[PDB]
Design a protein around this ligand. Sequence first.
Ligand code: CLA
Ligand code: CLA
Ligand code: CLA
Ligand code: CLA
Ligand SMILES: CCCCCCCCCCCCCCCC(=O)OC[C@H](COP(=O)(O)OC[C@@H](O)CO)OC(=O)CCCCCCCCCCCCCCC
Ligand SMILES: CC1=C(/C=C/C(C)=C/C=C/C(C)=C/C=C/C=C(C)/C=C/C=C(C)/C=C/C2=C(C)CCCC2(C)C)C(C)(C)CCC1
Ligand SMILES: CC1=C(/C=C/C(C)=C/C=C/C(C)=C/C=C/C=C(C)/C=C/C=C(C)/C=C/C2=C(C)CCCC2(C)C)C(C)(C)CCC1
Ligand code: OEX
Lengths: 503, 34, 122, 65, 41, 41, 37, 30, 79, 35, 32, 44, 341
Amino acid sequence: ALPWYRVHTVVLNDPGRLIAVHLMHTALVAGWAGSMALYELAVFDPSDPVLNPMWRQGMFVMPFMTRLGITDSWGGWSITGESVSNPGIWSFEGVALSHIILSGMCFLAAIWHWVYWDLELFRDPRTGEPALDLPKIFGIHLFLSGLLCFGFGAFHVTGLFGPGIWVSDAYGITGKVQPVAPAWGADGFNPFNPGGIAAHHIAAGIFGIFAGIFHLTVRPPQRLYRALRMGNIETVLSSSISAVFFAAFVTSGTMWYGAAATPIELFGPTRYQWDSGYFQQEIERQVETSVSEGLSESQAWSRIPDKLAFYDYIGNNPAKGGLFRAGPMNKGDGIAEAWLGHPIFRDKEGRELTVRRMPAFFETFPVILVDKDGIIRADIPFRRAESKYSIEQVGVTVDFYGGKLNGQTFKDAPTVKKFARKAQLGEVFEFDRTSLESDGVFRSSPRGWYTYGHANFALLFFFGHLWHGGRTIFRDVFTGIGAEVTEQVEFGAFQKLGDKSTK
Amino acid sequence: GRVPLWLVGLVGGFAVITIVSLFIYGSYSGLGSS
Amino acid sequence: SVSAATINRARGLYGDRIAALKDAVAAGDFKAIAEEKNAFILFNSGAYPTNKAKKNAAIAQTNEIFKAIRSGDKAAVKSAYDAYMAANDIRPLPEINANIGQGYSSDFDFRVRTKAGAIYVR
Amino acid sequence: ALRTRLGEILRPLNAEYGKVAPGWGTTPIMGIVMLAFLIFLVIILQIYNSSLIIENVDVDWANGI
Amino acid sequence: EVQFGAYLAVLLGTFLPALFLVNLFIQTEARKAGKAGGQDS
Amino acid sequence: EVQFGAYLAVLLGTFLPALFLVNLFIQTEARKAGKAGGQDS
Amino acid sequence: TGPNPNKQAVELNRTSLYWGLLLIFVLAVLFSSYFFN
Amino acid sequence: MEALVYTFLLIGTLMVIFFAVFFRETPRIL
Amino acid sequence: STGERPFSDIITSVRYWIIHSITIPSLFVSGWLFISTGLAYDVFGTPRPNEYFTQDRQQVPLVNDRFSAKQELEDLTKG
Amino acid sequence: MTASLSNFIASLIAGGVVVGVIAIALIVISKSDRI
Amino acid sequence: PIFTFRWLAVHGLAIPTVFFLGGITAMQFIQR
Amino acid sequence: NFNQSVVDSQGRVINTWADILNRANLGIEVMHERNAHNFPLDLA
Amino acid sequence: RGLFDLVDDWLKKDRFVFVGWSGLLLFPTAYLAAGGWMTGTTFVTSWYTHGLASSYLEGCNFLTAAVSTPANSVGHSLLLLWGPEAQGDFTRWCQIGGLWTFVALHGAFGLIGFCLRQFEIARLVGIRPYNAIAFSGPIAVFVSVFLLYPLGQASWFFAPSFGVAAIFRFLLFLQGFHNWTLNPFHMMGVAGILGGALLCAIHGATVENTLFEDGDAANTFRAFTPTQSEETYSMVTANRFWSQIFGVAFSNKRWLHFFMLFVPVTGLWTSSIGIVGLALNLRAYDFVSQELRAAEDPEFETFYTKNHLLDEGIRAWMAAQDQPHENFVFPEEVLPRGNAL
Ligand code: CLA
Ligand code: CLA
Ligand code: CLA
Ligand code: CLA
Ligand SMILES: CCCCCCCCCCCCCCCC(=O)OC[C@H](COP(=O)(O)OC[C@@H](O)CO)OC(=O)CCCCCCCCCCCCCCC
Ligand SMILES: CC1=C(/C=C/C(C)=C/C=C/C(C)=C/C=C/C=C(C)/C=C/C=C(C)/C=C/C2=C(C)CCCC2(C)C)C(C)(C)CCC1
Ligand SMILES: CC1=C(/C=C/C(C)=C/C=C/C(C)=C/C=C/C=C(C)/C=C/C=C(C)/C=C/C2=C(C)CCCC2(C)C)C(C)(C)CCC1
Ligand code: OEX
């Protein structure tokens, strides 16, 4: 009778089975959250939090665990670069275990409601029909959720009762889970202020409480109850989808563009920090304040932290990889070992040449060596016959500063070209490609993958809103149109559109 | 009535042909013609 | 998007348009500074668009130019205009050549018909 | 039809079904709240775009600490 | 050189949806055979 | 180091016999439902 | 407990098998080689 | 060894088409 | 059939041509003189065939800053 | 209060004018065009 | 019945078309 | 072929969307069968 | 009755063009989006945003005029006329490229108002909403290409301009930079659109050719009235045709016409999923082991590796004049090139 696509509409009429089915769904979801987090703990390498963070390893579930305060693990390692004796119940393993308990307990509860659909609670008093009073149920759920939102903001983010939230600095060198005083002014609507997140859930949770109290009491009017069809449960579904993909364009937007809710050293740097050269300007400012302190150059560059140099790198872009490149970034180019050094390229006149870095569009950009005012002193030729700007003609020399290759000139023309190709992309490091047999070719961040799936899921959920937004409004004509429509489909004789009370 | 339709959609249809042929003419004269 | 080449461009476009007023500091041409007020404003927007601390440094370095010419002390004008070029590194584009050159490849570049506009045609 | 203890505790919340205020209700109040919520979203959309600029507010990575 | 779990992801991405849709067909053919009482039940 | 087609031989040696025996069960439950005429055919 | 006044038959035609197989096999022709790389 | 997987799926579709032409559910007028 | 005067009724009407012999040459010549006098060059800011380049700048004039584009376009057209 | 804010309230008002000019114009005809 | 929205929904298009086609025929003559 | 059709009063080519279209074609022209060509124009 | 009820009567009054509640959203926004495209292609430039000429006034044909995206200097700003980069001053708002966002933000609500119009007709006429479902495809293509694609890239500069040649290079932009034909989400889209034009050509032809004699005129079009109770083409004969020619044929008119709904629509969805791939640059660009073996065997050439050399033709040659703001200066020895051309 039922086709394969209508196959779940059997649970519409029985509200006792909806709860049986939502419990099986919430057992699969939390079962996934526990089992994927256990999988990630088997893959995770805590040995280097500097050049091997969680986003470098393709950790999708772990950044969501640490951004609300799970920093420690039962293996003794802390993610904040500490050493803890006793993490307690709440570690990476304990959170992952707690979702498997919840998966098992919601599984059993799902069976209990599927066996017992005959709960009296789901019956109308007036008629005998199985019926759910959707405006009272909403007012219950809105009160709870607004209560829980207020409790989250007031007692977890502000850290009265809870541990706080991951709050990093501007450049992702240091961050730690700490409480946050809420920011009530216009500063709260700055997305990069984590005080907005505390002040959000307090204030939005307050309205979630007092709109709960409103909907617990006030009944709908006839005009909304007839139009919006609040006796129909699918009107809840369509309107809920609209809230769910609206929330996905917001999360996948603030994922890709960054916010205080999705910080750098947790999910990876954004795309737009490579575009402006967001870390270059921080490298060069910290060098200028070191040479203004009186330092010579080769120890001016060695004071730059390695983690900051890791962020000014192309293989750390979300927009660098591709779809069917599967897995961590370390399967892209390898485990990072150490910063080599900052190349400075000089010509025969003692000027300074910077290789023009590549945009995120190009898989390949050539090697072009430009000076301070952006005029080409050198390149690497494709056609090598009549080239005027080849490195062997211009005689470009290489001198490094800092890192493991500190203070080493290279006047050797091949190696000048080799480090010219390396310096085109990123700050040049030395990797380990032999650990997992990493290829020579890039990947993408959890910041790339989160807003990939969710900007697509929000599109499919736009269609599912129009499907159920359509099916509720036209619930009666879902199985045919009748013969009564033949009179009302006529240009004229009704001066309104379809209404038999006219003429 | 008093003016038939085939005269009407024709002087209008001439005026399409005169102006569209004028669009091809100044495609070869003036700007956009090199 | 703010990028590196957008910083390079407004620096290349208007670093000509600041340093070439060295001719107008000499006689003290008071209209030639007021006609180039927007040159100071838009180099200020383009050379430090993300860096707001050096931008707000170059706000007051621009205000000190116009505060001085409003009084008219030609000694204190050059005493401020020297500081503006020596803090922000104002530099015009000099002549490029066949070995030292290629200012432009596309005709869309901001230095096509400039004196640092040349190409090795080959 | 299987009365439980918890079925009787939550029986009042499923009491009314289709009990409806007789026409037009609070929908002028709902419209004004919904109009104020839309203005609130345009403000957030334009601060975040930086198509609207507030004193001492930048749209940029700051060091909460 | 070829990626690794793709031998798994193709063949379990064929057979597990292919064998599923077989059984909604085997279900009906048995249900329509149980309906009209023949030699099969 | 672990052998290669064993990821295939286990998982296709589980699921293809497991999904087969499901369907001799799904066949009867439909056949016994087609027999006794209820809401299902 | 009790038998439901909800439970129903689920059906799929012979053609819908052939659509459904040829959906799965042809998507497996498409998205195979992308997974292999 | 993926050319096995390629030719299994291509011949796989060619088998499904053969059953879809010659073993189809016939439509009846009745 | 919706209670409107038909299209083939209005298009043949003599009165229809009396109003439209006035207005259609009025709106056409208003469209002519709109850029026969070149007022669109000043309203839409589109450059004349003289005005793609100036004496001073002979380079392609692209906007370089977001916020201060109001000042940048005024300088590129000033020459 | 900035210059960018003064433009925005000027568009909230003018947005409410255009909605307000149309919505009054619909009511006035629909009362005169009763049915 | 001279208004009835059809006068408007034709002249919503028809007054800008004639004014712009009057412009475009001037564009056909403007020279460099 | 609308390349270099839009020309100002001075004579310089003003570029259109056709020119970046035919800048794609230059990119595919210089690459296709890149060693089969021994002579400048692609007549064959 | 109430005020709102009288308002509801007068816009739902049956006349030549139905206004409706959705027409309060459609007819202003759909007029301005179609109006701003006509004014922007007849007057407004690319000269300060792209450095191009794009208007009928400057030299463009129908084929090269375009309402063009703003500069990359402006990021993803909304380019409001009152906004912080226009500040009133319509002349400066056109030269910055404000009309493109004007058209794209009114075309967005125009398509919303047109789909809502298909819900409003279908209620009061009393009919199932499958036109509104089938129109959700062209909403998805618009939102994902003209809105979701720029909003993951650098700015609004990278969405395509509203013009004939300006879209043509966006076809060749996404080829060179993104390898767009290789994306299998796009291959499902091509199969939906070519298969959609397939079904339009089949069901057109078979209905015209299994028709019944309903008159003595050699013209058959005049032998139909819309009020008939019988069928005007023999579905039994049409089934016997294709089952005996192609091997496999339809036998439902309900399943056929759903299938003509289904194939063009689900082409546009699966294609528009993949253009949210490139918005954030997750793309099927290369096969890895196919590209490994080429870099260890110089003997080994495919048509696939031939396409990568053509892609770096598009990447390298176009980009100096594709993105003029990033000031690419490419030496002529740098530019990759074959022999003699
Ligand atoms: C003191 C009070 C206070 C403070 C400080 C905040 C602070 C904040 N609120 Mg707010 N809020 C408050 C009270 C407060 N709220 C109250 C009381 C309510 C009522 C319940 C809300 C309801 C509210 C909502 C509904 C949202 C916020 C959001 C935010 C955050 C803004 C993030 C940002 O910059 O933009 C990012 C957000 C936006 C730009 C929102 C724009 C809305 C969408 C994107 C427009 C587009 C429509 C649709 C998606 C189009 C799809 C297709 C298209 C993509 C092509 C920020 C933390 C947003 C958030 O969570 O962001 C993370 C958010 O969505 N607030
Ligand atoms: C919260 C989301 C939600 C919910 C609860 C429902 C619920 C329902 N939908 Mg529905 N729908 C949704 C979103 C949702 N939809 C979206 C987003 C779309 C657009 C793609 C649709 C499109 C849609 C159509 C077109 C139809 C329904 C139908 C139905 C009804 C029966 C569904 C059924 O039997 O499926 C049966 C499905 C299967 C047996 C298997 C499908 C195989 C899928 C493709 C792969 C399995 C998914 C995989 C396991 C993991 C999912 C991951 C998750 C993140 C998505 C039911 C009321 C039907 C209906 O109303 O009856 C007339 C119907 O015709 N829906
Ligand atoms: C109903 C149809 C409709 C819709 C949906 C839109 C939608 C839009 N228009 Mg628009 N427009 C319309 C009709 C419409 N227009 C008409 C008819 C015209 C011709 C006059 C224009 C002319 C126009 C221009 C010239 C521009 C737009 C722009 C815009 C966009 C930005 C809106 C914005 O930021 O302001 C938000 C505005 C609101 C949310 C107003 C809603 C009503 C409010 C809530 C009432 C408040 C009133 C109250 C008294 C205010 C209190 C203030 C008090 C405390 C002092 C948006 C897509 C801009 C654009 O596209 O940029 C590229 C732009 O520059 N429009
Ligand atoms: C193509 C777009 C589209 C279409 C056709 C529909 C269609 C529908 N929606 Mg809907 N919806 C959409 C997008 C869409 N939705 C989006 C993006 C959201 C999230 C914000 C929603 C949220 C939503 C809810 C919450 C509900 C519906 C409902 C409905 C149904 C009833 C009709 C109705 O009231 O529409 C909704 C009305 C509109 C879409 C009108 C939009 C006009 C706005 C006010 C213009 C505002 C201009 C803007 C603010 C300018 C400033 C922005 C600028 C700065 C960029 C109908 C099936 C209802 C339903 O399912 O009934 C059972 C329901 O409960 N919708
Ligand atoms: C000399 C002849 C040369 C051609 C012979 C072989 C071609 C026959 C093709 C049939 C296969 C499809 C039948 C499946 C599905 C099938 O059984 O359909 C049978 C189906 C019959 O439908 P009915 O009208 O019976 O619908 C019953 C409905 O009520 C279902 O509820 O026919 C169709 O609807 C039209 C079929 C379009 C034909 C689809 C073609 C798809 C092309 C395949 C792509 C090829 C992949 C190749 C990979 C290498
Ligand atoms: C019973 C019990 C128990 C146990 C439990 C368990 C053991 C559980 C587990 C669970 C789990 C372990 C779960 C998980 C699951 C999984 C899932 C749920 C998955 C999902 C999937 C999907 C959904 C899909 C995906 C995808 C793909 C594949 C491709 C791409 C796309 C996507 C993403 C969509 C205990 C002892 C506690 C208690 C008592 C009772
Ligand atoms: C933006 C803007 C606006 C708007 C504007 C408008 C709304 C406009 C309109 C527009 C329009 C609405 C237009 C129209 C025009 C048209 C035209 C100009 C036409 C042309 C013609 C032709 C050329 C034709 C063609 C053809 C055909 C179709 C067929 C056959 C062939 C032929 C070729 C003949 C305003 C002021 C509000 C304000 C703000 C800004
Ligand atoms: O083969 Mn295919 O591509 Ca028609 O051009 Mn001549 O041939 Mn070859 O060269 Mn160029």
